[PDB]
């Protein structure tokens, strides 16, 4: 499936809605779901949420 399990933040992402996982550039995000082309699901610092797929670099 080519799923992404980890991704590096390329840019800062500010969460503007309650379902969003914000991060700063360079942070390594755990990717839980990479199948939606726009919004991926991740975990970071014990927070779960959605973030833009093209804001990160899949690792490995």
């Amino acid at each position: 499936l080519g799923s992404v399990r980890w991704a590096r933040a390329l840019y800062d992402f500010e969460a503007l809605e309650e379902d969003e996982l914000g991060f700063r550039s360079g942070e390594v995000v755990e990717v839980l779901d990479s199948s939606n082309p726009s919004w991926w699901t991740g975990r970071l610092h014990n927070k779960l949420g959605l973030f833009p797929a093209n804001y990160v670099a899949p690792m490995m």
């Binding site: 390329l10 840019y11 379902d19 726009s38 919004w39 699901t41 804001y55």
Partner: peptide, 12 residues
């Protein structure tokens, strides 16, 4: 950064 996505978000 790039523009935010505008697609509807899936549920979690």
């Amino acid at each position: 950064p790039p523009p935010r996505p505008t697609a509807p978000k899936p549920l979690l």
